Design a protein around this ligand. Structure first.
Ligand SMILES: O=c1[nH]cnc2c1ncn2[C@@H]1O[C@H](COP(=O)(O)O)[C@@H](O)[C@H]1O
Ligand SMILES: O=c1[nH]cnc2c1ncn2[C@@H]1O[C@H](COP(=O)(O)O)[C@@H](O)[C@H]1O
Ligand SMILES: O=c1[nH]cnc2c1ncn2[C@@H]1O[C@H](COP(=O)(O)O)[C@@H](O)[C@H]1O
Ligand SMILES: O=c1[nH]cnc2c1ncn2[C@@H]1O[C@H](COP(=O)(O)O)[C@@H](O)[C@H]1O
Ligand SMILES: COc1ccc(O[C@@H](C)C(=O)Nc2ccc(I)cc2)cc1
Ligand SMILES: COc1ccc(O[C@@H](C)C(=O)Nc2ccc(I)cc2)cc1
Ligand SMILES: COc1ccc(O[C@@H](C)C(=O)Nc2ccc(I)cc2)cc1
Ligand SMILES: COc1ccc(O[C@@H](C)C(=O)Nc2ccc(I)cc2)cc1
Lengths: 331, 331, 331, 331
């Protein structure tokens, strides 16, 4: 083995991230303005815009979930608050019309009680929200939810980074599989634990297990630019979950911060020291203030539309068949 | 597949850019001063110097096109102005002698009317100037022009980044094919849309479809140094189109700008916010003031001559057969 | 040969360092808090925490060795001091309970006399501490020690960077093999001599020679983050030796230094100019003050525990079977 | 072809530079102080230290050539001065004892007359000093010199970067072949012409043509650290020519320069604007003042000795058989 040792499988793959690849242009009859951006969030739920906001307490509470649903996407309400308040935020969303909304639950003690309270409040999507879903306890929670409320509510499981982990969540009954171990902008899992999987390769591997069963993949974390959304979808994901890109908006939780004449909002991992107040696996940071969500989503969808035009993708399903070129460091 | 998924074609190639390669020296009887720099712009038109200026409103109007033609190259007049003014700039060029001149048209509503006005004014080259030429509408415009004015005017089509796209433009009747999707210095297509193709690989692929039909390839965008011109030509291109390298000259549009004691000129993408006043795919920037065009062209041709000496290339056609070494990040 | 010459073996391998790889998550029933972090330092000695402190005079004297042993690891006392003082530091450690302790000796003139004095003082581990252990003199010292005091004391030999060198130390009777030629944070061997081996590949190669003989590998140098500890162990090492990560602690030798409002401690190679007062192969530097050792070790073990959870490793022996993904520059 | 086009030979090799590789440690009975650093400069001339100084007017005049010869190396007198002064500098060297000395000549008009004047003055080595030696005029100059003064004077030819070019110089009668097109620290050939060859690969290729004929290779340019000297020799070179590393010494031409409280000396390419007062292929720069040459040479040889110890190389001929590991960007 050229890299050392006698075992070819020790280093199992070469992991690519968004920056490692570009979409190749292809024959196109598609204009950006005419492309259909709708896509499956879960087996049953289709969104007009393939974007959901992260279940983080500096990204998504009721105001963000409302704005996301109106923009044609969806919010997933964070779970770093008492059950009653989370359920009350769900009802607040529903009070603003027939809006789609999701909410995160864990696999802890109150997790099941949390899930029932959220169902009572009328949630559409339950997101089993863990650092590592390749675990019997997580798979059981997914399964128990799907068997109990599966008729009324779609159940998302995450996060995974391998084909085998995605396959297990599919077996357990997940209506969608969320991919991302390591890539988050505020994530330090890679330096603290030494663990991760570059996101383009993780999506390709998860899609290989999920697509044959008709289960959509949510690409979660590491998206910095509107172009990364197109890359993630072309890699086979059906939607993208955004944290950093939405944390700077007016609709996110938290106040404006003025630093050296420029405006910011605070953005922090749910595994950061302050978010837990296990060693921390996230940082507490700041992102530039970006203004209204509707504005950000427009640019983001604008970039996606451009990619669909370049690749001749009339739909997201067609974009999922596009090809990449791998680039070098010089790129 | 080592990078993920089960489909070897998902990541179709490894894309190289100018910085990824160097020209290998070879047996030479050629002195830099004795090399022949002339080359085909189109099937019928040969330039003394293989350089054309970009169809951008911070690069090429009548003054630049005149100076370029006198230096042995050509200008392509930008189309971000009323038809009448563009045709008037064409006539202005012709008034300064028997000078070669090109002009950009789109595929829009007034595009055909634009083209006829330009023909009337005596244009030599019509450049069908689009972001993505692999499109029936673009191919039809190329074909319609070639069938209508093809005897009197050479028709260039662009831009493309793949073998298949170049082949389609050849089929449609292009007298030259322009290559560049992603590499421009002011281009943000790669981050906004996630789309592009590293320019050395794009040129190799386009040339593979164009050379067998005797159609010249114009390498457009991403050239930072005189050395990149030699690389592009050695990759198989017959000419190079320059934006950033010429935007800082006295002959380009726009005024001098003084910032922190240094002189600059403004340089902006045609897909930038201000150039359109579709989400923006270019930035508005500044480049150092470089002085007279004749000076810049001399250095640029000087570098090209040096490469021809090192590679034993007496002509551009010989340079197109030179070999590369690929370098690593450390280079 | 694509990289030059006609000899495929001239460039014998592709060397990976910690930053080149990530641990892949795997099926897990293991919680971070429930993982067993114990591991073999040598054939006979098992530590509760797989960490030892470097034999450097800005890292380990009696205070550090005591604190390391109490934290479940071990210190290796540096040898840049008279024999009597080193033996006196050994006795000082033993005076603070039944604490494990190691001490470095060379292969020089006083080295044997040093070793005997250390045995007399009750040392548990003798570390034959050289820049290049693939040498008959070093191997003989290892062998002579193992034959003379081998019943009472474990003998470590280092440092090596190849399979063949590790194999020779195993033949010579080493109870553990220490790996690291080039990777130290204060090391300039790579720029001064041009010599080295990236640490992940060096560990894989050493383990290939050591594991089949039941000899543990100590990964020494280049560890910057808690994640690197998990990577080194997953590559096959049984423990990690730390210099820079521990040099900033209260328990390390040396005073506090205040520079531009921030607190530091000095940290220097044993091959640096000042440490020898052969051209220098280390620098004299500064590291941020980190506070108590117990605090640093907690974070470090915390990160290791996280990795064990992600990889489903209940023990270090299981972690040694985990898989990597290789990442690109973009990562 | 994965990188583009249909021709596998278009990109002929993967070029490695010094930073791409490290020397692997190997079984050693060699102590740094006991290694034999002597090596062939040319077929007939062996130096005690395998280092020569560049033929540049900010590196080598009579004072440097004297100091180099006394340190066991040699200087090559630059040729950017009238013939009479160069010959007078040669005689000045000889006046300081039986010191070895070389001198550069070109292939120009006065080049032959220059060479004869230098022979008259008692030069030992004539260095045919060109940017591109793969040229009939250069090869003829080498041959004419070897046939005319070949009994009394060794003739070096350079520079080359390929196997074929090295082979041609061997055929022409060169007593040594100098390698380096592109790598010089003050060289801009790579950006101006787009031409070059990474130096480790260039040395491997040149040695493949030169070693079988017993012709020594001089590695010229790109050496930044003492470690690069060991790498170049291990790649198969017999000596290294140094510019930047020696330009900062007291013995180099030029005055001390004080910039922002630190001492420098000017260092400029022979192809820079000021050195010619063909477009420039070098810059005019500054290097830190390093003090006496004897001091610099000691560190440099010190590093080489260290490498010989690590690789078990008792002689330079043994070092030429050492192995590399290739490293990644992360290294
Ligand atoms: O503290 C943390 N450590 C690791 N990952 C986190 C943490 N907090 C949130 N995440 C994940 O990072 C995603 C957002 O990544 P981003 O869009 O790049 O900022 C979130 O949706 C989570 O999946
Ligand atoms: O706004 C833009 N977005 C993407 N490409 C552009 C834009 N404006 C001009 N270009 C292309 O970039 C080329 C100039 O690239 P440059 O020489 O690297 O500055 C132009 O000839 C166009 O092909
Ligand atoms: O001067 C030196 N040159 C090269 N390696 C050194 C030197 N001093 C200590 N080392 C090694 O570097 C290790 C510490 O590396 P670190 O933890 O990255 O700072 C030590 O345990 C030694 O193996
Ligand atoms: O102007 C120049 N352009 C390209 N190479 C040069 C020039 N001047 C000197 N050289 C070469 O660069 C070598 C010194 O490289 P350095 O030691 O890295 O600074 C010299 O021995 C020459 O072979
Ligand atoms: C994907 O988003 C997140 C990732 C981590 C995180 O926090 C860290 C502290 C955590 O949960 N670690 C952990 C590691 C192994 C296992 I097994 C279980 C948990 C929070 C959010
Ligand atoms: C090559 O030079 C340019 C590139 C882009 C550009 O502007 C952007 C906004 C544009 O045209 N985008 C777009 C993307 C897909 C399709 I399909 C059509 C147009 C302008 C010049
Ligand atoms: C692993 O930690 C260290 C590495 C080097 C070092 O110092 C240098 C000066 C040294 O010992 N060099 C040397 C090189 C070849 C041989 I063979 C022997 C020694 C000190 C510690
Ligand atoms: C190796 O050291 C040097 C390299 C270049 C140099 O100057 C440039 C301007 C030069 O000579 N160029 C040139 C390029 C092709 C041919 I063919 C001939 C000369 C001077 C020294």
């Amino acid at each position: 083995v050229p890299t050392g040792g006698d075992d070819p499988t020790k280093i199992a793959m070469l992991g690519l991230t968004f920056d490692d690849v570009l979409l190749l242009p292809a024959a196109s009859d598609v204009l950006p303005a005419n492309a259909d951006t709708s896509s499956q969030l879960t087996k049953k739920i289709r969104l007009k815009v393939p974007l959901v906001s992260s279940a983080m307490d500096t990204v998504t509470e009721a105001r963000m979930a409302i704005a996301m649903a109106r923009a044609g996407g969806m919010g997933v309400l964070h779970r770093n608050l008492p059950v009653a308040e989370q359920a009350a935020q769900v009802e607040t969303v529903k009070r603003s019309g027939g809006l789609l909304v999701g909410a995160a639950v864990g696999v802890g003690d109150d997790a099941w009680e949390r899930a029932m309270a959220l169902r009572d409040a009328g949630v559409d999507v339950l997101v089993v929200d863990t650092a590592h879903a390749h675990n019997r306890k997580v798979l059981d929670m997914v399964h128990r939810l799907k068997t109990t409320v599966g008729d009324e509510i779609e159940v998302v499981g995450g996060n995974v980074a391998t084909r085998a982990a995605a396959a297990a969540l599919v077996e357990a009954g997940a209506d969608a599989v969320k991919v991302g171990v390591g890539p988050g902008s505020i994530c330090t899992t890679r330096v603290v634990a030494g663990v991760g999987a570059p996101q383009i390769t993780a999506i390709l591997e998860a899609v290989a297990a999920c697509a044959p069963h008709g289960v959509p993949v949510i690409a979660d974390g590491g998206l910095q630019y509107s172009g990364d959304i197109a890359k993630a979808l072309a890699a086979g994901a059906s939607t993208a979950m955004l944290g950093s890109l939405l944390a700077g908006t007016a609709e996110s939780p938290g106040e404006l911060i003025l630093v050296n004449g420029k405006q910011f909002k605070s953005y922090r991992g749910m595994g950061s020291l302050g978010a837990m107040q296990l060693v921390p696996e996230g940082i507490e940071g700041r992102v530039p203030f970006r203004g209204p969500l509707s504005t950000v989503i427009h640019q983001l969808v604008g970039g996606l539309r451009a990619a669909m035009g370049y690749t001749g993708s009339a739909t997201i399903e067609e974009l999922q068949q596009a090809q990449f070129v791998q680039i070098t460091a010089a790129g």
